[PDB]
Amino acid sequence: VQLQERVIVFEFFYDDDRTMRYQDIAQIRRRLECSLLCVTTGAIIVSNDKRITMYDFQGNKRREWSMESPVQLMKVVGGMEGREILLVGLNGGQVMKVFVDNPFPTLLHKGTAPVKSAELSSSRSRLAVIDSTNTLQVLELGEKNELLFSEDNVTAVAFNIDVDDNIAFTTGDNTLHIKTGSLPAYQQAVRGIVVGFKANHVFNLHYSNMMVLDVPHAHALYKYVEMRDFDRAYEVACLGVADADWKMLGLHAMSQLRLDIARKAFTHIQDTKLVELLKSLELRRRQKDSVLYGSILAFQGKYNDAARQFMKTGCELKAVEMYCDLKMWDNAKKICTDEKVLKDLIRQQARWAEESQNFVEAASLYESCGDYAKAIGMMGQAGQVEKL
Amino acid sequence: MFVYLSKRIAMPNGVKVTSIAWNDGQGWLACGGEKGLLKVLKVDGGPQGQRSGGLSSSQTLEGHDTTVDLVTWNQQYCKLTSSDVSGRIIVWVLHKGMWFEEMVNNRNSSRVVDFAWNPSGTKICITYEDGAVIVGGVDGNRYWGRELPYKLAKVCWGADGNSILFGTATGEVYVHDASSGEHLSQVEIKCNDGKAPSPLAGLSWHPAWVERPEPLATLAVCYQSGKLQLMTSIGDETPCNVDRDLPAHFISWNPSGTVLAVTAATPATEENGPGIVTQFFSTEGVHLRTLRVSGKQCGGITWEGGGLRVAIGVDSSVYFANVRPNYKYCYFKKTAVFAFTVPDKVEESVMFWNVNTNERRTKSVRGLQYMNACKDACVLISRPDTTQQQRMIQLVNAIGSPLETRFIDMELYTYDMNSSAVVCCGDESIYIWQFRDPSTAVDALDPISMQASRAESQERVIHVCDLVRGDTAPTMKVRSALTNDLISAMCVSETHMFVSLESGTLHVYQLSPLQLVSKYILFARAQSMSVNCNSTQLAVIHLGGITNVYCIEREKFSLVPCKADTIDGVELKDVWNLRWAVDDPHRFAVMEKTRMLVYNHGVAEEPVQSCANLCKFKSLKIRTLQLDELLLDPERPRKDYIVDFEAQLLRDMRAVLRDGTAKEAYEFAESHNTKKLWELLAEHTLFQLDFTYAEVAFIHCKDYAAIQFVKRVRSLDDPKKQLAEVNAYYRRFDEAERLYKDVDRKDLALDLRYRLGDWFGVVRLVQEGALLFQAWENIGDHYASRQKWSKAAQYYTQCRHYRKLARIFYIIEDYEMLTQLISMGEHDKELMVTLGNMLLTVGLAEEAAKAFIAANEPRMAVNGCVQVN
Secondary structure (H helix, E strand, C coil): CECCCCEEEEEEEECCCCCEEEEEEEEECCCCCCCEEEECCCEEEEEECCEEEEEECCCCEEEEEECCCCEEEEEEEECCCCCCEEEEEECCCEEEECCCCCCCCEEEEECCCCCCEEEECCCCCEEEEECCCCCEEEEECCCCCEEEEEECCEEEEEECCCCCCEEEEEECCCCEEEEECCCCCEECCCCCEEEEECCCEEEEEECCEEEEEECCHHHHHHHHHHCCCCHHHHHHHHCCCCHHHHHHHHHHHHHCCCHHHHHHHCCCCCCHHHHHHHHHHHHHHCCCHHHHHHHHHHHHCCHHHHHHHHHHCCCCHHHHHHHHHCCCHHHHHHHCCCHHHHHHHHHHHHHHHHHCCCHHHHHHHHHHHCCHHHHHHHHHHHCCCCCC | CEEEEEEEEECHHHCCEEEEEECCCCCEEEEEECCCEEEEEEECCCHHHHHCCCEEEEEEECCCCCCCCCEEEECCCCEEEEECCCCEEEEEEEECCEEEEEEEEECCCCCEEECCECCCCCCEEEEECCCEEEEECCCCCEEEEEECCCCEEEECCCCCCCEEEEEECCCCEEEEECCCCCEEEECCCCCCCCCCCCCEEEEEECHHHCCCCCCCCCEEEEECCCEEEEECCCCCCCCCCEECCCCCCEEEECCCCCEEEEEEEECCCCCCCCEEEEEEEECCCCEEEEEEEECCCEEEEEECCCCCEEEEEECCEEEEEEEECCCCEEEECCEEEEEEECCCCCCEEEEEEECCCCEEEEEEECCEEEEEEECCEEEEEECCCCCCCCEEEEEECCCCCEEEEEEECCCCCEEEECCCEEEEECCCEEEEEECCCCCCCCCCCCCHHHHHHHCCCEEEEEECCCCCCCCCCCCCCCCCCCCCCCEEEEEECCCEEEEEECCCEEEEEECCCCCEEEEEECCCCEEEEEECCCCCEEEEEECCCEEEEEECCCCCCCCCCCECCCCCCCCEECEEEEEECCCCCCCEEEEECCEEEEEECCECCCCEECCCEEEEEECCEEEEECHHHHCCCCCCCCHHHEEEEECHHHHHHHHHHHCCCHHHHHHHHHHHCCHHHHHHHHHHHHHCCCHHHHHHHHHHCCCHHHHHHHHHHHCCCCHHHHHHHHHHHCCCHHHHHHHHHCCCCHHHHHHHHHHHCCHHHHHHHHHCCCHHHHHHHHHHHHHHHCCCHHHHHHHHHHHCCHHHHHHHHHHCCCHHHHHHHHHHHCCCCHHHHHHHHHHHHHCCHHHHHHHHHHCCCCHHHHHHHHHCC
């Protein structure tokens, strides 16, 4: 806290009763003039115009850097104790890392406009730069900063502290975009600027009001499922999606002949029907995408579409047996066309009628089949003397 | 919010009630009456005591020579106080369960008109008609006494506890100090005309929101004329003054502070005769409900300590009216959803509680006003600003992840949702947000949320009176064309939409497309409506209280108004909840009075004694939620608040399967032909190792997966493994692993525990006597996804999986072990490149360079040393 004549450094701690407390651990009785201030583990840093001066907690100077342009932004991005990184933006478009042990800043970004705000990724392998024109550029850092994306009229930006490729930026039309990877951005249209971004929350400040907004991981999951990339779909899902979302993910993974992620998506559902579907599918796989999506839809509850899918591959026998096993022969008769399979299907009808205590119908089915050897006994059981 | 009479207690001798006061802490109701009648009854406020009618104690006290005029309670010490016309005041304290006097005083100066306790229950303001005030302590230590000049008639206590509000005989209200008692200020009144001094009948300030950032309008000032003015502070400038035509004599806030109750003794002017009419409002002045009983004189009105019962002194008797508060809740996908208030916030906390896994996700919603659900999604409607008439409509999924949002700037009053639209009605206009293509088949592949996201939204705003057709142009322009018939209720089906008007007309629209396809005439205005599964029958709770199930026929769809055909055998009074069977169009459950009835085809079952709110009705099962107990510990829901009932058909099938042959169960199932009965039959015969009944049951109800399961179980040989698999099917995993062990097969047990995905159990099974490392890695992934970095690091170190362990260490800002990792990862090259890049980015280039040379490529090492100088 920079006061009118001192700088007071507090430290936060918890007592025995698990109630957080503050203790003032340092006072620096130096009237300091700066445009930017940054505290760290053991030293404070002030910055005015061109000069960045780092002081210890007593008040003795520790280091100083002279830049090329006046400093617009300064922010500690974390590091080892006593070797903590800084991030500086200059009027010349230079974004640089100022290690508190080094006297030499390292160049990250060379921009064409004064840098108003810039933040580093959680993994610090990607960088977001806001220029003087309120134009945001996110690039992959390296020997040359390869640009990933750019978006205009950005008022604020934040990186996800817990997730690497997850950005949340608020534009000037009071809209809060949330990008993940290469996907488009979920848009919420909320007032104020985004000041923080964790894995499952967005801390958005509007004047004097801080609001915590949930991060929809289902929205990214849908898009990842749509374009048939499933690794990122699973990774976004693990951050917390509803049970129906896991169900849909597993079903789509199965329908793309990708069962390894399917076995993992149905761990979070607690629905044994999909689990037995999975184990039957792997029973097949230990021994065709249009063949097995028919099986998926059969287990789903749409047998007509399943049979159509089995028609698509040209093998009608599997759909014929599937319709036989449901014991509705009306829909099984049209699909079956082989000369022997008509007799086989009516024989199965006769056997089922025999086992279903429907004796007159069984006799009629046998007369259609012509199996008089069993038809005599079935007709005797039915009890019509004249027909006998 | 619903009300219904549920008890009546007669005073001895028929002595007319003059005062009544109900304790909160324990439940000791107290009543008073002329000739010095004073009674203390004990009622159990728990739902068990409401079902069993618990009245444990009844003691007639004495010590008053004339009518007991004022009765007040102290809930911190459970101390009663009573008054008399003669001018005596008696305090009463419980000794070993009974009531005895502790102090009797007689001022012999004036008649006491009020006294009250602070929220702490530490000071009592005994005030008289001459204006004399005495503030006494708990024991009796007189803090201060005064003789104020004006004539006092009503006295309240400040919410904070440092101010005392007084009321004059004329009608003016002042604010004084708790300690000094000087004339601090005067409340700004505007309901009072000021032409003539009107006496006041209610003055209560509920302290439930003292430490609230925006304190609610819990102050209440009521006059004998009937003008109610709800203020939020001592000198609030914009009260929510809501007027009522009826007069007023007594008011009472509920213990939650969320409902005010104002009672009036209506004379024989009306054709209904003399009576007692109680109006129940919310804190915003919204009129919630009204209960009318027969009587001539009103003695008082009290609330039960749980705020679920109101005791009304009608002439020479006491009525207990059970109060069903309007709970904003829903249930879907094995997930209850319910909102509740915290005293230190303005927002409302909406818990999404999965009861199958007890998983809790709390969402903060500001000014929530509606909640509903369908298939795979829920709808939350809120008003973030009370002044600004902007309504936020958020479609969310099961765990609360927001799916879609809309903002409509018109004043809605009724709301509803189906699988493809959200419909909200104001006075006359109707907003329809179709967020999904209704022609698309909702399934597990394409749930409501995914289809809603992938598709486009169509918003319309139509009027009640205009005959919307298929070719009518959609518009977002509300119309305030002055039509007298305002909308009173509204309901939505999966294929239609039903609006009720204030007169009693019933418009029936389609949805896809939006056509006003019919009109009907109902017995009176509908205050609540619901529609069966296939939109053939429609249950309506009218304004009087009578519920009727009208028939809706597509053949009889004509634009001309006509009478609607009801259903015989269904005429219910005082219904406060209803649900329709989502799979059977005829069955429906009704919570009325204190009991549940499960109608099928119009004929009910035996009443079931319950007060749990109805949540779901499906597969002959009825899931209900005891919200009155759940809201006592909103942050700590217990599965014991979920109560499952069954239909008589289901109970009869259970009885047949319990003590009957398999053939009798088969005959029962074939005669009644319900999916649930076939599933139950198949389950019971599978647990008894007979598979033909299971096969025919899984054939009659359409389930190909279960048929394949039964065939797979049949194809096995060892019956113990078959019973283990059957236990695995029906979520009996402990027994399945037991029966797998009993055939010396631990492999099948660990496979079961891995497929179910409790990797803790896989760890337990593996440790008993690769896969242990795999289970540890999965637990580490689970703990990482919940941002538990320490425990994830624990299980990754136990797994010895350094690729993710390094990322963990980078996250914790713990570079000691990060630099350590090189020694144990030297045989990994890619890990070295990643570690060197990480330490390059963090600036530690020495360990970065040694990691890079552990990768046998030092050009990046010298590069990193150069870039950091």
